Amino acid sequence: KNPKSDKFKVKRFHHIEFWCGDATNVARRFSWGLGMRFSAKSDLSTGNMVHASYLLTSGDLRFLFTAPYSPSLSAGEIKPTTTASIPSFDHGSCRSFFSSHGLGVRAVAIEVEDAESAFSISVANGAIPSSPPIVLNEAVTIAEVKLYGDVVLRYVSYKAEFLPGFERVEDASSFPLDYGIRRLDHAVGNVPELGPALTYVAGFTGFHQFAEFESGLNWAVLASNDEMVLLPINEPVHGTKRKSQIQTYLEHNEGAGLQHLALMSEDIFRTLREMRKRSSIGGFDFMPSPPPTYYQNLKKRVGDVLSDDQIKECEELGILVDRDDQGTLLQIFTKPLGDRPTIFIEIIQRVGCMMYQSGGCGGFGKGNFSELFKSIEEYEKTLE
Amino acid sequence: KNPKSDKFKVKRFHHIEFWCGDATNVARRFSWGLGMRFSAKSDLSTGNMVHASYLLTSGDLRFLFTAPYSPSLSAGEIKPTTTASIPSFDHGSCRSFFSSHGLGVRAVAIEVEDAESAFSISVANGAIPSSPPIVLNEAVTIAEVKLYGDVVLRYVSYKAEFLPGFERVEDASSFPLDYGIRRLDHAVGNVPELGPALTYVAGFTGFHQFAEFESGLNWAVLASNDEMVLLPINEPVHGTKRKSQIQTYLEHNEGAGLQHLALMSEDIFRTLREMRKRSSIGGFDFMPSPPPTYYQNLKKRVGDVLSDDQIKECEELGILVDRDDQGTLLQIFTKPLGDRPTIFIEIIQRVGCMMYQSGGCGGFGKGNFSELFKSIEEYEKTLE
Ligand SMILES: O=C(O)Cc1ccc(O)cc1
Ligand SMILES: O=C(O)Cc1ccc(O)cc1
Ligand SMILES: [Co+2]
Numbered sequence: 180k181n182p183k184s185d186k187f188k189v190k191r192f193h194h195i196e197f198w199c200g201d202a203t204n205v206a207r208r209f210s211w212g213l214g215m216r217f218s219a220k221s222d223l224s225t226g227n228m229v230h231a232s233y234l235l236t237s238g239d240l241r242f243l244f245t246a247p248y249s250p251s252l253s254a255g256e257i258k259p260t261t262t263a264s265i266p267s268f269d270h271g272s273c274r275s276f277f278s279s280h281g282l283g284v285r286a287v288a289i290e291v292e293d294a295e296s297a298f299s300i301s302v303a304n305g306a307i308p309s310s311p312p313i314v315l316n317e318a319v320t321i322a323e324v325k326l327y328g329d330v331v332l333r334y335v336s337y338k339a340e341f342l343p344g345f346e347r348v349e350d351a352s353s354f355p356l357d358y359g360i361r362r363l364d365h366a367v368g369n370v371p372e373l374g375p376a377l378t379y380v381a382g383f384t385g386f387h388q389f390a391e392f393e394s395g396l397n398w399a400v401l402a403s404n405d406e407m408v409l410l411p412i413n414e415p416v417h418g419t420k421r422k423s424q425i426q427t428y429l430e431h432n433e434g435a436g437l438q439h440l441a442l443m444s445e446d447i448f449r450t451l452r453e454m455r456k457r458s459s460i461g462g463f464d465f466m467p468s469p470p471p472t473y474y475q476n477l478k479k480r481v482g483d484v485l486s487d488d489q490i491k492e493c494e495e496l497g498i499l500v501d502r503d504d505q506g507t508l509l510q511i512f513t514k515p516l517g518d519r520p521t522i523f524i525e526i527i528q529r530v531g532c533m534m535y536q537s538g539g540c541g542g543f544g545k546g547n548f549s550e551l552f553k554s555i556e557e558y559e560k561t562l563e
Numbered sequence: 564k565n566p567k568s569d570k571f572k573v574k575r576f577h578h579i580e581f582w583c584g585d586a587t588n589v590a591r592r593f594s595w596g597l598g599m600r601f602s603a604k605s606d607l608s609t610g611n612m613v614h615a616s617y618l619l620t621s622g623d624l625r626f627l628f629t630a631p632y633s634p635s636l637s638a639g640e641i642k643p644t645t646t647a648s649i650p651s652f653d654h655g656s657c658r659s660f661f662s663s664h665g666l667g668v669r670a671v672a673i674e675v676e677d678a679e680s681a682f683s684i685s686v687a688n689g690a691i692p693s694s695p696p697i698v699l700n701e702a703v704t705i706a707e708v709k710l711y712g713d714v715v716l717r718y719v720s721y722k723a724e725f726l727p728g729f730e731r732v733e734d735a736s737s738f739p740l741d742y743g744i745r746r747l748d749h750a751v752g753n754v755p756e757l758g759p760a761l762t763y764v765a766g767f768t769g770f771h772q773f774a775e776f777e778s779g780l781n782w783a784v785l786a787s788n789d790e791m792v793l794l795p796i797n798e799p800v801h802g803t804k805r806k807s808q809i810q811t812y813l814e815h816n817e818g819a820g821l822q823h824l825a826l827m828s829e830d831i832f833r834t835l836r837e838m839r840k841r842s843s844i845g846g847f848d849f850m851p852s853p854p855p856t857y858y859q860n861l862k863k864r865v866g867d868v869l870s871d872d873q874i875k876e877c878e879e880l881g882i883l884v885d886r887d888d889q890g891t892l893l894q895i896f897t898k899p900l901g902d903r904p905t906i907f908i909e910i911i912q913r914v915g916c917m918m919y920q921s922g923g924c925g926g927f928g929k930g931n932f933s934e935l936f937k938s939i940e941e942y943e944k945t946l947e
């Protein structure tokens with residue numbers, strides 16, 4: 180059931196902006212850990228006296244890292260005279276976000292046909308405005324509305340290189356790292372109440388509930404017309420034996436925010452080999468692999484989709500496999516990206532649903548809760 | 564002229580603490596860029612609900628990275644009931660330091676015979692107290708006094724593994740990186756007025772002016788009795804054609820602070836080869852190398868100390884060479900470690916003055932200003 184009810188033309192995920200305390204160290208860590216190239220910059224060397232902003236890219240995936248300078252550098256400026264390249268940036272807002280949440284995503288940006296129209300229709304339909312539409316060098320239009328917590332949904336539209344005022348980075352400083360990551364598949368938010376969050380966001384976007392298929396959480400996925408922009412939202416479930424992971428997120432994040440980014444790889448095995456080689460030399464750590472029970476039980480579930488050799492490669496890399504009625508999903512999760520048990524990353528690859536591949540092919544891993552529990556119980560048995 | 568006037572027994576440099584917004588990403592970046600091992604941690608997994616602290620080590624060099632958690636995690640605590648492993652840590656002080664200065668050194672820590680006595684004598688002699696002496700698990704004593712700006716001089720003494728409450732880090736997560744860095748040689752502060760800063764610090768430590776040997780700055784070096792603890796201090800000189808680099812520091816740092824850390828390598832050529840291989844894949848960038856004029860003029864100055872082959876290796880690595888009347892100094896400087904043009908790192912190796920090597924053997928590079936200017940002028944000539 181896809182009603183195609185988008186209230187404005189949405190194209191694709193455009194970028195993810197992290198608000199940092201020091202953008203340089205986060206961007207260099209992410210570049211090496213994920214194999215993303217330094218591609219654009221806006222900072223003191225480009226005339227930006229307000230914020231330091233560094234763009235990493237892998238395929239179509241764009242990660243932006245931004246941190247404020249001393250406000251004293253731009254004290255003479257006013258918004259009309261600003262040297263910031265992102266006019267929605269605010270020293271106070273950024274310092275407050277980072278002190279409240281630690282390292283985290285500030286903007287989920289989507290490209291649309293007309294950012295000014297997307298903003299107006301959204302706000303007309305209940306969206307809480309964050310930054311009004313602003314035209315940059317008569318070329319790009321940027322606008323922001325609240326999504327959940329302190330995360331904004333950012334609309335970008337081009338009349339026709341990232342943003343005006345950004346410079347492509349020098350060749351020597353731009354090493355062509357690539358571990359196979361190609362685009363952002365989905366971006367997941369954690370909220371205290373799922374119902375009102377769903378009603379708010381679906382209310383101003385016209386996004387529809389994506390069709391899917393007792394421990395932890397409840398969730399639902401909002402989707403654009405072609406289901407290429409996908410936004411799952413989680414809420415905690417209280418009363419369980421094990422403390423809900425969503426609740427722990429909310430406590431350590433000081434409220435709602437973005438929980439994880441799901442990054443599509445064109446070759447998840449090569450991606451994971453490359454990231455795992457760097458886990459202890461400045462990259463990212465991964466969640467503990469499931470027990471070999473899980474991989475023993477993979478044969479009857481996905482034996483028609485993956486060969487026994489490709490299954491064994493899943494076992495040594497710790498990859499999880501799930502399947503719906505239209506496709507199969509390979510996935511794995513990192514440990515938290517920063518000091519707090521909050522934001523993390525998922526690497527995925529989808530197989531099936533070719534027309535191009537349709538969005539969400541394979542779902543989002545819903546059946547992995549039951550299969551993992553069954554695996555831990557059967558592994559204990561296999562141990563005793 | 565070494566009066567040996569230390570007012571308390573000072574041993575060696577013990578560690579450098581960075582105050583960060585996210586300690587995880589800075590520590591992983593530094594570990595890979597400098598080849599330092601993850602060795603100890605104090606964080607949520609060790610019961611610390613206050614700050615995340617990660618220790619990197621290479622030889623005797625200890626880099627500590629600390630960032631605050633949400634204060635809500637420790638809201639029920641009081642100083643007697645604290646779970647912090649560094650009792651001088653304060654949420655407000657840290658957030659204020661980082662928002663004012665960006666990424667930077669908060670503590671220069673020196674090991675002394677008795678931290679409580681060092682604190683008392685210092686304060687008796689004009690030192691501005693920062694954190695009174697605190698005994699940790701009846702094993703280590705920690706105290707802090709103001710050094711310059713918001714940097715503290717930290718005294719540590721052991722009755723007899725970094726600090727109580729820290730845990731050695733798991734073997735898998737601890738990769739034995741080593742590029743040859745072995746200890747901290749000196750730590751340099753930038754201040755607006757050199758005279759009063761010298762008088763304050765020498766006044767409460769009894770440190771003496773280290774004997775050395777028109778553009779930029781004036782400086783002087785304070786030294787402990789055996790001249791193993793070395794603390795140079797710079798002030799800007801105004802009125803020059805080129806804006807003083809010390810003045811730019813003060814503006815972007817919002818005042819006085821630590822300008823650079825000088826790290827001794829046992830093999831500066833191997834250190835620089837290893838760091839330069841990683842400059843564009845998440846490590847550190849280096850200042851532009853001097854012109855080959857400089858290396859052409861190296862023969863007559865240090866031709867008795869380095870061979871023509873060892874000189875050519877200096878040329879391709881960009882190393883600078885200086886010499887006093889007792890030793891020779893190999894040095895090189897990184898670009899700023901973070902977003903701001905503030906803190907950077909120096910890699911050095913000293914040759915000569917063996918008794919063990921005496922401290923400061925070769926000086927601190929004073930003659931490199933004249934030689935670099937002469938080189939740029941002779942290179943322009945060689946160009947025309
Ligand atoms: O997949 C989701 O919808 C989000 C999510 C996934 C795993 C998890 O443990 C918590 C939330
Ligand atoms: O060496 C010093 O005493 C500090 C310093 C060195 C080089 C420089 O450009 C500025 C300060
Ligand atoms: Co997911």
Ligand SMILES: [Co+2]
Pocket residue numbers: 751825909927
């Ligand atoms: Co120096």
